[PDB]
Amino acid sequence: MSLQHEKVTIAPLVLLSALDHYERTQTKENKRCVGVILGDANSSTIRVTNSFALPFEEDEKNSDVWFLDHNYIENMNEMCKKINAKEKLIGWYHSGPKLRASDLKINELFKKYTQNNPLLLIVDVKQQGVGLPTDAYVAIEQVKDDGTSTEKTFLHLPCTIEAEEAEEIGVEHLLRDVRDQAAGGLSIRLTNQLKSLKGLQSKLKDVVEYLDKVINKELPINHTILGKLQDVFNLLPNLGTPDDDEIDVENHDRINISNNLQKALTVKTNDELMVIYISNLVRSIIAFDD
């Protein structure tokens, strides 16, 4: 098993396919579609190219009770080679809104067939998230230095996408939106600028109330989270630094370029002002002549 990971890259196909398979098992209300996840690994970047359904039953009475049809998984993999002989198990997807604690026991079963720690890719079917509608975890077993026993736990990794160029234009072809969450002109990136700041608000809210929850409702004092929080402050500026004074000098510089650029545009349009007057001036004569 690879115990080295960094990122998860996801093909667009994977997400869409799990939503299709979800409605065709007709799953909802704690019955959640679970299929196998196919792709490349032994790589720090988990590259997920495809996904398929397995025959799976989820009991809603107990989620620690589940059905997985193990025999099917071997047969399906032989047909995966027929398509392309470089797709293997690298985990399993969940279709639910969020992480279950029965998902740790499920993850055990796919270890048997993987040369990499098994991936949990939550494909939402309500399409939440302010980035991608996918969350990503990989199960890691580690000692915890907080005085608590060895856990197997799902630790978060970033989500990214790797899309084939051939496929990507199909996304553009399908999509008739002119894009307001991706770069464009000034106004488009002006939305992108406000959108990012409003994203920071939402993310900043959740930390504050997690900290409240720890010392009154008694959620674990998790040192690893709070350590990254200490580094947020140390990497945070302080007023009266000559670096943040240099920002003032650097503001002057780019604004002045805008100031001259603005003048340049004003000149050019005043050439067209005079042109049109010369066009009206000739067309007085033509009218008068008729």
Binding site: A53, A182, N251, R254, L265
Partner: protein
């Protein structure tokens, strides 16, 4: 009366489209193929819900390179997952050539037409789908005898359609002598839209994230110099621009590309670029501390 055949439009679900592209480009230039699972409802809608790939061969497409043994196992895999419906045809990918059926492919198609008459052949060009257009065209065999009787007009009855011919040359030979091509529409849901349009996790990490300010100074330097050269060129032009006949001035005093226009494009890009960048600096500096 007999049976009348009429227009259809092949609706390639968003899922189906990505799979054909993925499987087809990856296997190019060796020919790729696979079956189309879907359903026919209506009399104007072929709805392809999913496709899969059948194993490649270095004999490419053949009537005996279809392989039903593999089809049967695959069908039972969808049956256990509750996804089987009806195989609505076959697709195959020509490598860098156009969409047209080969003579061999006509006989591959003749087999599936027996099994279901509404079966299509969907010819894919993957090395041409890296434009801003995806090139995919669809065919469906029509009886040779019917073509003699002038029953190609029959296939466009009861709408004006979006009728257009995207490709001729081998295509219009095969249409004439075999098939009726179909236009292609795409189906997708409102869920699937949101999945497709989303392509970054850095959506909220792109107006707080910024580029190095040395790179910005280099950029302002580059931009201002470029427009300085274009201005000298413009100045040479606008020593006249006052004689009869616009076209004579454009040749003589170069208004070849119009240095007015050229300066406008360049001005406007760097001007817009700087307003975002200043705005990013000022947001972070004031808000964070």
């Amino acid at each position: 009366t007999g049976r009348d055949d009429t227009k259809e439009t092949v609706y390639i679900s968003s899922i189906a489209l990505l799979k054909m592209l993925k499987h087809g480009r990856a296997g190019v230039p060796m020919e790729v193929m696979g079956l189309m699972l879907g359903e026919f409802v209506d009399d104007y809608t072929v709805n392809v819900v999913d496709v899969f790939a059948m194993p490649q061969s270095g004999t490419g497409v053949s009537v005996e390179a279809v392989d039903d043994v593999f089809q049967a196992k695959m069908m039972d895999m969808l049956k256990q997952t509750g996804r089987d419906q009806m195989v609505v045809g076959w697709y195959h990918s020509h490598p860098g050539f156009g969409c047209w059926l080969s003579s061999v492919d006509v006989n591959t198609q003749k087999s599936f037409e027996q099994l279901n008459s509404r079966a299509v052949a969907v010819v894919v060009d993957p090395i041409q789908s890296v434009k801003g257009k995806v090139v995919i065209d669809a065919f469906r065999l029509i009886d040779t005898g019917a073509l003699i009787n002038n029953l190609e007009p029959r296939q466009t009855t009861s709408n004006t359609g979006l009728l257009n011919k995207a490709n001729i040359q081998a295509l219009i030979h095969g249409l004439n002598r075999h098939y009726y091509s179909l236009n292609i529409d795409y189906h997708k849901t409102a869920k699937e839209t949101k999945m497709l349009m989303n392509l970054h996790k850095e959506q909220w990490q792109s107006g707080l994230k910024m580029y190095d300010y040395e790179e910005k100074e280099e950029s302002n330097l580059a931009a201002t110099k470029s427009m300085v050269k274009i201005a000298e060129q413009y100045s040479k032009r606008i020593e006249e621009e006052k004689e009869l006949t616009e076209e004579e001035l454009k040749t003589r005093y170069v208004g070849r590309q119009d240095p007015k226009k050229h300066l406008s494009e360049t001005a406007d890009e760097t001007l817009e670029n700087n307003i975002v960048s200043v705005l990013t600096a000022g947001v972070n500096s004031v808000a964070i501390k």
